[PDB]
């Protein structure tokens, strides 16, 4: 259901000049969980690059069984 | 305007030299305990 | 007649710097005298040192 | 007066780990700290000199300064860049006590290569080819845009311009010429309107 | 006749370059895209038409001079000599020689400044000489076009969010 609205969510996220605070927090947490280098989404400016179509595919790919 | 016969454009300030004297170079001491 | 400004005082640095350069006065009192040799002030300070 | 070592010690009395060594004064003595190996130092270390007061916080190889490093000389001049065989070589930056900054290449402990020198008092910059700590060729730029392109004298001539072309942005005039021995500027032709020397 | 013809052709060429520059400046407002892309398109237009050495947009320690735009709510700032000023900030930490200019992006029907277009000529990557009035006018026009484009972007985004 998350990937159902992937295009609309990405479009709405990319058009924002400002920083949506809580949504930025949850996006940063999700980027930590997917094992990103963590030095590339500190500020919202750099966190802009990470989200793209490929983000939603990676969410399904990440193992949910691994400890 | 001063009307003397002497004038010329100013050269740039000389870049200041290094800590080496006209040369001594400081070296880490190498003696074992 | 007309308006009448008062030139500020003159410091030894301005006098020493004035002996190095050679300029035509632009006629207005807010004008950069030179970039090199460096001059500590605008046109008015150069005029005061010349005076 | 054997120097005191504090830290892990290998066999034969050879330091082999992250520790601190203090040396006997002849004015305190020197002091090293950081990784050591078999009696010589290697890896990121910090050596503080006793008499002069210089501090070198940088890499080490075979007991000599090597690789990236940073030093604070007795004078407040701070060097930061590449070292080989405890001599300044390669790319780096140097900050002088006057405040003048230099960015560029070094060779045998002097300015040598392609670099820029920025004076503090006047904002003029010297950009181009340095040799033996002197300026050989390039563009001398004033604080507004007026500049001079040409060949400058070496360290023997104290980096004075010798031949080239002046451009003044206040009037926007360009004149090519040279310098006499007395320092008087001798132009080859009358000044002509032009543009800045953008190589 | 020859002298008159030469003068006329010079005037015609000047008018042609003015027209093409203004035409480019008018096009940026029409573009519909992500905000970062509109900012990138502006930077390219400013660099190509103007003589600016570099153009960069943006979305005790002295206060950076660019903050004057936000604090005094003044739309355009121009520093003919960064050497004279003291609040100018250099990204590479090496003192630079040249001019600088920054005209903010203010949305219409509001006063909030969203972006800032900064074009400068700094040696050695730039001319190092003050910007001519035509270059500054082009930077101002590009920023105004970007302002209209950003207003359109915000309008479309709000409509989509409320849809």
From Swiss-Prot, chain A:
Give its localization. Cytoplasm, Cytoskeleton, Flagellum axoneme
> What is the reported phenotype of gene knockout?
Absence of radial spokes.
Whole-protein coverage range: 471 to 537 of 738
Additional note from the record: In-gel analysis assays show kinase-like activity in vitro. However, such activity has not been confirmed using recombinant protein.
PTM annotation, UniProt? Probably methylated by PRMT1.
Say which family it is in: Belongs to the dpy-30 family.
* Name of the protein this chain belongs to: Flagellar radial spoke protein 2
| Purpose | Flagellar radial spokes contribute to the regulation of dynein arm activity and thus the pattern of flagellar bending. They consist of a thin stalk, which is attached to the a subfiber of the outer doublet microtubule, and a bulbous head, which is attached to the stalk and appears to interact with the projections from the central pair of microtubules. Binds calmodulin in a calcium-dependent manner.
From Swiss-Prot, chain C:
Q: How is this chain modified after translation?
A: Probably methylated by PRMT1.
Q: Which residues form the signal peptide?
A: none
**Compartments it resides in:** Cytoplasm, Cytoskeleton, Flagellum axoneme
**Which Cys-Cys disulfides exist here?**
none
Q: How does it assemble?
A: The radial spoke head is made of five different polypeptides (RSP1, RSP4, RSP6, RSP9, and RSP10).
Protein task: Flagellar radial spokes contribute to the regulation of dynein arm activity and thus the pattern of flagellar bending. They consist of a thin stalk, which is attached to the a subfiber of the outer doublet microtubule, and a bulbous head, which is attached to the stalk and appears to interact with the projections from the central pair of microtubules.
Q: Can you tell me which family this protein belongs to?
A: Belongs to the flagellar radial spoke RSP4/6 family.
Could you tell me what this protein is called? Answer: Flagellar radial spoke protein 6
- Which organism encodes this protein? Chlamydomonas reinhardtii
Q: Which residues of the full protein are shown?
A: 205 to 255 of 459
